């Protein structure tokens, strides 16, 4: 931080930790002759190991926030607040974060009281806050791709060939029941206007690549049937996943519909004069706000703010436990600024369960907000400017009533 700057508040939008596959469909089973390995928990649940890996991040956050003078060297209950999505995986990630940040302090997490409905903070379109127009979705995704979607597979030939090899797709029951080239067999298509999906090879491979990454992060004895040997290969496979998220979650039209409530909540917590839905029982003296969500949430916020990144040592742009960390800093004369970093465990740190300390830290990338005309060279954006960007980026129809 520049000369005289002081950290005042932190807002962490974190993905949940290492989880089992959220689904295992007949198609997923049929695209390989290999057997998918069994997980120790129900579909979509965070594992005990994933909780531990989140706690290690909590421990890192504690050391960092102590160092920067924000936290004491148990915090007061007012100083730390957790809002988790209703899923087991997010709830337990919020708990695991507190177990690392403030061990055995019994700090509360919060979440929506009806866990049988979507939380509109995280899924406003699904919750029925607002809707999208089918023709505008189609147009926006095509523009984001810069190529017709029908030929998207051509752009990812190398990656799709590598997926095919890892799966042994030509030998699979799918190829037995239907040339059997992964890319040609499953052309990319957009399925749409409150439900939007990328169908075909890239969509499917995106899911599978993420599952392989989760297997590795879980320290499973056999990952992708032993077929992923190098970091290059991990990058090539996760490229498919990152691409699907660029199109389905970063595309500004979609990003603004699904991301508006979160961005308002984040902005308000940083000190913007943006309406946001108050979080129940939060203190005006709050110092750390931890929001436990999903990769789509991070990607939405990325899209809205025009923020892009690559993470050294981490093939997934939105890995389990990876978090956008927004910070309000003030200069010596009390002017507020916002910084944003994408803070994460490398693939190796996930696999090894590495302790994360000041000496051996989490990965961290400082993000540029391109529209922040008066940002400093080290990426500090005046709050006044940040607030204007937020005002321009939100979809008013999607603000939380
Ligand atoms: K294991």
């Amino acid at each position: 931080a520049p000369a005289g700057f002081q950290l005042e508040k932190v807002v962490i939008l974190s993905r949940h930790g290492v989880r089992a596959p959220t689904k295992m469909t007949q198609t997923m089973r049929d695209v390989t002759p290999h057997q998918w390995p069994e997980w120790p928990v129900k579909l979509g649940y965070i594992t005990p190991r994933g909780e531990h890996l989140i706690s290690l991040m909590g421990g890192f956050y504690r050391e960092r926030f102590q160092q920067q003078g924000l936290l004491p060297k148990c915090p007061t209950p007012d100083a730390v607040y957790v809002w988790a999505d209703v899923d087991q995986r997010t709830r337990k990630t919020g708990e695991a974060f507190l177990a690392g940040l403030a061990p055995q302090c019994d700090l509360a997490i919060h979440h929506q009281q009806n866990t049988q409905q979507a939380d509109p903070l995280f899924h406003p379109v699904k919750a029925g806050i607002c809707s999208m127009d089918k023709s505008q979705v189609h147009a926006a995704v095509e523009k984001q791709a810069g190529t017709p979607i029908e030929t998207l597979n051509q752009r990812y030939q190398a990656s799709l060939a590598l997926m095919s090899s890892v799966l042994d797709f030509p030998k699979s029951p799918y190829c037995q029941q239907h040339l059997c080239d992964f890319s040609q067999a499953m052309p990319s298509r957009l399925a749409i206007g409150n439900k939007v999906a990328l169908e075909g090879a890239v969509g499917l491979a995106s899911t599978l690549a993420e599952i392989f990454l989760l297997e590795h992060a879980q320290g499973m004895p056999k990952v992708a049937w032993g077929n992923i040997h190098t970091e290059q290969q991990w990058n090539s496979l996760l490229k498919l996943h990152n691409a699907q998220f660029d199109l389905m979650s970063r595309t500004p039209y979609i990003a603004k519909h699904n991301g508006t409530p979160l961005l308002q909540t984040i902005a308000h917590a940083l000190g913007s004069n943006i309406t946001s839905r108050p979080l129940p029982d939060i203190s005006p003296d709050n110092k750390i706000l931890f929001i436990a969500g999903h990769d789509a949430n991070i990607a939405n916020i990325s899209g809205m703010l025009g923020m892009t990144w690559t993470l050294p040592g981490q093939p997934d742009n939105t890995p389990p436990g990876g978090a956008l960390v927004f910070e309000r800093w003030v200069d010596n004369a009390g002017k507020p600024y916002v910084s944003v970093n994408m803070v994460y465990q490398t693939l190796a740190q996930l696999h090894d369960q590495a302790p994360l300390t000041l000496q051996h830290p989490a990965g961290s990338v400082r993000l540029n907000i391109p529209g922040c005309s008066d940002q400093t060279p080290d990426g500090y954006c005046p709050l006044s400017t940040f607030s204007r960007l937020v005002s321009h980026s939100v979809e008013p129809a999607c603000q939380l009533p």
Side-chain angles (χ1 to χ4, degrees), residues 1-5 7-61 63 65-72 74-133 135-149 151-188 190-193 196-221 223-255 257-387 389-401:
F5 271 46
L7 177 66
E8 293 198 335
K9 196 153 164 195
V10 180
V11 180
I12 303 169
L13 173 60
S14 184
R15 189 176 177 210
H16 62 76
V18 175
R19 61 160 174 77
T22 50
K23 60 187 191 195
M24 182 59 59
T25 62
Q26 193 63 55
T27 298
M28 290 162 65
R29 290 197 189 284
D30 283 351
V31 293
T32 181
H34 305 310
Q35 308 299 301
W36 291 96
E38 191 174 20
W39 281 73
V41 299
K42 294 165 77 148
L43 296 171
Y45 279 28
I46 189 176
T47 64
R49 175 177 172 114
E51 294 166 344
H52 179 63
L53 286 162
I54 292 299
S55 297
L56 290 176
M57 284 295 263
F60 179 68
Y61 287 131
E63 295 204 349
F65 299 146
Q66 284 174 348
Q67 172 189 37
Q68 292 175 306
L70 189 62
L71 282 195
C74 289
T76 61
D78 286 350
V80 179
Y81 188 92
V82 178
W83 185 262
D85 198 5
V86 294
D87 291 341
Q88 183 271 6
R89 59 182 176 278
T90 49
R91 296 187 283 93
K92 293 288 200 215
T93 292
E95 301 165 26
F97 162 74
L98 295 172
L101 188 87
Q104 310 137 283
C105 301
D106 284 6
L107 299 182
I109 71 154
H110 290 80
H111 62 78
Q112 161 164 297
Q113 293 192 68
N114 189 1
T115 63
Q116 298 188 61
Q117 290 299 332
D119 180 347
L121 181 66
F122 297 94
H123 307 104
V125 176
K126 191 180 180 287
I129 293 303
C130 60
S131 300
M132 292 188 287
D133 181 279
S135 38
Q136 292 185 57
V137 170
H138 193 253
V141 172
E142 301 276 4
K143 172 168 150 175
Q144 188 79 0
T147 341
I149 299 302
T151 65
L152 193 72
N153 294 1
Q154 276 58 244
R155 175 176 291 169
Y156 294 99
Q157 184 276 144
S159 286
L160 291 172
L162 177 61
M163 178 66 74
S164 180
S165 177
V166 166
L167 294 166
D168 197 6
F169 174 69
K171 192 178 185 224
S172 70
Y174 180 98
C175 289
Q176 144 88 38
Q177 294 166 193
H178 310 96
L179 180 70
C180 202
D181 176 84
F182 192 72
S183 177
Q184 291 179 49
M186 290 182 190
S188 284
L190 198 49
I192 299 168
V196 189
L198 181 62
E199 307 302 327
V202 177
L204 177 61
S206 165
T207 299
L208 308 181
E210 174 70 9
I211 291 172
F212 300 149
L213 184 132
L214 292 164
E215 298 175 355
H216 185 84
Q218 181 68 12
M220 288 196 151
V223 168
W225 313 282
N227 299 321
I228 309 170
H229 302 105
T230 70
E231 197 76 1
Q232 187 273 330
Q233 290 172 327
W234 279 112
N235 290 343
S236 185
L237 295 169
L238 270 294
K239 179 178 197 183
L240 291 161
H241 186 255
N242 300 323
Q244 178 245 314
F245 273 73
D246 187 48
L247 296 181
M248 296 291 101
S249 292
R250 299 190 67 263
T251 300
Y253 184 82
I254 300 174
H257 284 75
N258 274 309
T260 283
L262 266 171
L263 186 58
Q264 297 187 309
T265 297
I266 290 163
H268 184 266
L270 291 169
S272 304
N273 295 315
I274 311 275
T275 285
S276 79
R277 190 116 98 188
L279 301 166
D281 318 301
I282 200 160
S283 174
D285 290 344
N286 181 238
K287 298 200 179 312
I288 303 177
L289 168 59
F290 181 95
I291 302 170
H294 306 274
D295 44 23
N297 303 124
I298 289 171
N300 290 163
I301 297 292
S302 176
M304 294 184 75
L305 298 170
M307 299 186 301
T308 59
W309 61 82
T310 195
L311 311 174
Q314 178 48 260
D316 182 357
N317 290 346
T318 50
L324 287 174
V325 180
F326 292 82
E327 298 182 341
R328 168 199 173 85
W329 292 82
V330 292
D331 75 11
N332 177 251
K335 179 177 175 62
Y337 289 81
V338 179
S339 75
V340 200
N341 286 84
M342 189 51 201
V343 181
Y344 67 95
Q345 281 141 307
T346 66
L347 193 58
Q349 287 171 321
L350 291 173
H351 183 268
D352 302 344
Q353 311 188 260
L356 308 169
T357 64
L358 266 37
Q359 185 195 33
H360 295 113
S364 184
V365 176
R366 171 54 50 73
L367 309 177
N368 168 236
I369 297 157
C372 187
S373 48
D374 54 1
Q375 67 187 121
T376 70
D378 51 343
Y380 289 86
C381 181
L383 181 62
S384 54
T385 306
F386 182 79
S387 298
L389 270 9
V390 173
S391 297
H392 297 343
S393 294
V394 295
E395 210 73 76
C398 304
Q399 297 185 210
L400 284 196

